[PDB]
Amino acid sequence: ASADWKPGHAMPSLFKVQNVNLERCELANYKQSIPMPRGVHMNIAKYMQLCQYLNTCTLAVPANMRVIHFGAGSDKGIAPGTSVLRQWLPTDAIIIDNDLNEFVSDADITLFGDCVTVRVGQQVDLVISDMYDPTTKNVTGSNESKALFFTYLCNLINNNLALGGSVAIKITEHSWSVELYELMGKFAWWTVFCTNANASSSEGFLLGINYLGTIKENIDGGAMHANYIFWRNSTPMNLSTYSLFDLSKFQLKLKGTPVLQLKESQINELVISLLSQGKLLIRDNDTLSVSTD
């Protein structure tokens, strides 16, 4: 099985263009667990498979890369995903992580508290979010669009994300946002990626690749989540970590992506084309300053 050796599954345009009602997500293997290779944390395998798929995307990888990592605390006091980010990113990349409670991490900056307390003074190159609110488990009525931390993440994309930057934001069947789906239309490309290590979950990472700051695709956010659930309900995915058997090319390619300062009026077809190819970032080149407010 070829798909078992891939890091996971990415939502295809076949289901992006459908028009269906939002249905209940029923996975045939729901809640089934896969043993982790070498007693290693499950978040190791999930983050590595996420990084392996991003290795196939047109990520902008500059010097002094600015990465922010929300929901980085897990497994009672540690941050295995941040360590994977350290293994994946260039050695000169800046990692800022954050979660609600105290934890120990290999990031350059670690901030405790609500994600709203994370004040980003400049613009960043890559946003990873594994945030999930426990109250989402209290399924009472219909599955409606959620605010929660998504309001903060949507404002971050519109204000504190470099042109050409990219995001990877965890969603589930009930942890999702209309506004965030519609923001994917402001990137050069988008998808939802589901790791094979956690294929038994409705969890997926909403990916926006290369931020353009302008609407490229008009997306109905509510209808697109229904398409996401329709895809999960239609697509067998077997638990697997086979993609981690060969890690000879795991590290993010040292692309040396240039960082340029441009006025909005100066952004033309060439700039948009370079941004869409992962060949350019537009933001400040000050010194990154992200503190607790």
Binding site: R38, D106, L247
Partner: protein, 124 residues
């Protein structure tokens, strides 16, 4: 489990946390768990501390902060610079001492001129 919080609280009642942890494990105390073991192509150089994983076939690579007693216990680091030597980096550990990553690093020192674990790599 709750045993990690037990030994992590114990090194808060001492003036020498390194010897406190080492005396605890040497007397049969439960080794500290939940260290962040990485998955690596075991084709690395083998040095003690590295910016990227450098495990040999006889090594395992851990996230540096998770194997540092002072990071895990949230106590002051003893380094004169005040900078942890493991945090933000990766620490290679012999495969036979995987049962207790924290106590190994507290029990050994990388070679100054050579950067390999003395007795576990250093050939000077």
């Amino acid at each position: 489990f709750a045993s990690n919080s037990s030994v992590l609280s114990l090194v808060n009642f001492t003036v020498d946390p390194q010897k406190a942890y080492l005396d605890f494990v040497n007397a049969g105390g439960a080794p500290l768990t939940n260290c962040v073991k990485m998955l690596t192509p075991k084709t690395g150089t083998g040095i003690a501390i590295s910016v990227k994983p450098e495990s040999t076939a006889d090594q395992e690579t851990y996230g540096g902060a998770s194997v540092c007693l002072y990071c895990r216990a949230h106590i002051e680091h003893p380094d004169v610079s005040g900078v942890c030597k493991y945090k933000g980096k990766f620490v290679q550990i012999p495969a036979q001492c995987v049962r207790d990553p924290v106590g190994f690093c507290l029990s050994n020192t990388p070679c100054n001129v050579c950067q390999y674990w003395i007795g576990y790599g250093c050939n000077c």
